Write an enzyme that holds these catalytic residues in place. Structure first.
Site, PDB file in Angstrom:
ATOM      1  N   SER A   1       0.821  -1.398  -0.030  1.00 37.41           N
ATOM      2  CA  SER A   1      -0.040  -0.019  -0.082  1.00 37.41           C
ATOM      3  C   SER A   1       0.736   1.330   0.140  1.00 37.41           C
ATOM      4  O   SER A   1       0.139   2.322  -0.172  1.00 37.41           O
ATOM      5  CB  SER A   1      -0.965  -0.114   1.282  1.00 37.41           C
ATOM      6  OG  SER A   1      -1.977  -0.896   1.039  1.00 37.41           O
TER       7      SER A   1
ATOM      8  N   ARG B   1       4.761  -0.887  13.166  1.00 40.83           N
ATOM      9  CA  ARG B   1       5.269   0.073  12.047  1.00 40.83           C
ATOM     10  C   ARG B   1       5.645   1.637  12.480  1.00 40.83           C
ATOM     11  O   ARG B   1       6.550   2.037  12.536  1.00 40.83           O
ATOM     12  CB  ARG B   1       4.604   0.008  10.571  1.00 40.83           C
ATOM     13  CG  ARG B   1       4.602  -1.543  10.097  1.00 40.83           C
ATOM     14  CD  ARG B   1       3.669  -1.564   9.118  1.00 40.83           C
ATOM     15  NE  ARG B   1       2.294  -1.290   9.287  1.00 40.83           N
ATOM     16  CZ  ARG B   1       1.517  -1.262   8.577  1.00 40.83           C
ATOM     17  NH1 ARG B   1       1.127  -1.381   7.469  1.00 40.83           N
ATOM     18  NH2 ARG B   1       0.090  -0.845   9.420  1.00 40.83           N
TER      19      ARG B   1
HETATM   20  B1  J4W Z   1      -1.957  -2.011   2.129  1.00 35.61           B
HETATM   21  O1  J4W Z   1      -0.482  -2.637   2.278  1.00 35.61           O
HETATM   22  O2  J4W Z   1      -2.080  -1.472   3.340  1.00 35.61           O
HETATM   23  C1  J4W Z   1      -2.998  -2.249   4.110  1.00 35.61           C
HETATM   24  C2  J4W Z   1      -3.646  -3.125   2.996  1.00 35.61           C
HETATM   25  C3  J4W Z   1      -3.099  -3.332   2.023  1.00 35.61           C
HETATM   26  C4  J4W Z   1      -3.293  -4.098   0.922  1.00 35.61           C
HETATM   27  C5  J4W Z   1      -4.165  -5.136   1.451  1.00 35.61           C
HETATM   28  N1  J4W Z   1      -4.712  -6.335   0.504  1.00 35.61           N
HETATM   29  C6  J4W Z   1      -3.918  -7.198  -0.240  1.00 35.61           C
HETATM   30  O3  J4W Z   1      -2.741  -7.056  -0.129  1.00 35.61           O
HETATM   31  O4  J4W Z   1      -4.775  -8.069  -1.004  1.00 35.61           O
HETATM   32  C7  J4W Z   1      -4.381  -9.341  -1.384  1.00 35.61           C
HETATM   33  C8  J4W Z   1      -3.246  -9.118  -2.426  1.00 35.61           C
HETATM   34  C9  J4W Z   1      -3.927  -9.926   0.009  1.00 35.61           C
HETATM   35  C10 J4W Z   1      -5.306  -9.799  -2.104  1.00 35.61           C
HETATM   36  C11 J4W Z   1      -4.988  -5.121   2.317  1.00 35.61           C
HETATM   37  C12 J4W Z   1      -4.784  -4.228   3.468  1.00 35.61           C
END
Ligand code: J4W
Length: 245
Positions: free
Chosen positions: A51, A231
């Site tokens: 993210s 974090r």
């Molecule tokens: B991000 O890093 O901040 C909180 C967060 C973020 C990404 C995700 N989803 C994600 O990675 O989706 C899959 C690839 C696991 C389906 C959730 C929360």
């Protein structure tokens, strides 16, 4: 200041050791990069941005008129991973909540061709987004090092990315996460939920009272049952130990 570098180094290492993980925090003061933590070799290893990519996704979307800063991205009414995402939000609100579905919509509006051009133009990470416009920052193929993340943060803090100044200012306004005395911390968290091991990020900069900007990037392994706030906690303790806040 009277504190030895040996003592600073030991202290910051201990913050990672106490969380029972492995990680590094890179701090940039002017041109000089300093690497701290308990696993210094992570500094030039590639991880998914997770993210933290929302920063760049927002710059790209705003620059290319795929969204405005007041536009409300409506919840479609489908169940989401977190209840807090089951609501209508602006890009800024979605940044703060790390609302993946809003940023997936933004990525789909941008589209694969434009997204790959823009990620190449900015020279972000390994610059490869592959063929899936809506998850390339989450599961690969896009990867970036902690050194690259702190240099990205340095670029954005000083308005040096190849976007309009107004675009960069709009995204910076979305990133304010803490005020500590007269210091402001601008940053975006990352958690690679879809890779093993899972990567955790907090990348941004401190804006000090006097206007000096001190970029940083924390990178660690997120372990089973670890809270996302670790974090932030390690980052703030590290920055405070160094006197940056
Ligand atoms: B991000 O890093 O901040 C909180 C967060 C973020 C990404 C995700 N989803 C994600 O990675 O989706 C899959 C690839 C696991 C389906 C959730 C929360």
């Amino acid at each position: 200041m009277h504190i030895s570098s040996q003592q600073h180094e030991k202290a910051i290492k201990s913050y990672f050791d106490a969380a029972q993980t492995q990680g590094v925090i890179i701090i940039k003061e002017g041109k000089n990069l300093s690497t701290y933590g308990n696993a210094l070799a992570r500094a030039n290893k590639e991880y998914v941005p997770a993210s933290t990519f929302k920063m760049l996704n927002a710059l790209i979307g705003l620059e290319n008129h795929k969204a405005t800063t007041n536009e409300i991205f409506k919840w479609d009414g489908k169940k989401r991973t977190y209840p807090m995402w089951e609501k209508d939000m602006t890009l800024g609100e979605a940044m703060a909540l790390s609302a993946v579905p809003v940023y997936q919509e933004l990525a789909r509006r941008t589209g694969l061709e434009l997204m790959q051009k823009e990620v190449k133009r900015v020279n972000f990470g390994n610059t490869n987004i592959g063929t899936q416009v809506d998850n390339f920052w989450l599961v690969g193929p896009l990867k970036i090092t902690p050194v690259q993340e702190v240099n990205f943060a340095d670029d954005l803090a000083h308005n040096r990315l190849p976007f309009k100044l107004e675009t960069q200012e709009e995204v910076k306004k979305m990133l304010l996460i803490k005020e500590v005395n007269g210091s402001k911390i601008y940053a975006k968290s990352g958690w690679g939920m879809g890779v093993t091991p899972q990567v955790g990020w907090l990348t941004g900069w401190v804006e000090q009272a006097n206007g000096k900007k001190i970029p940083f990037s924390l990178n660690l392994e997120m372990k089973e049952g670890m809270s996302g706030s670790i974090r932030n906690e390690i980052t703030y303790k590290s920055l405070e130990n160094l006197g940056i806040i």
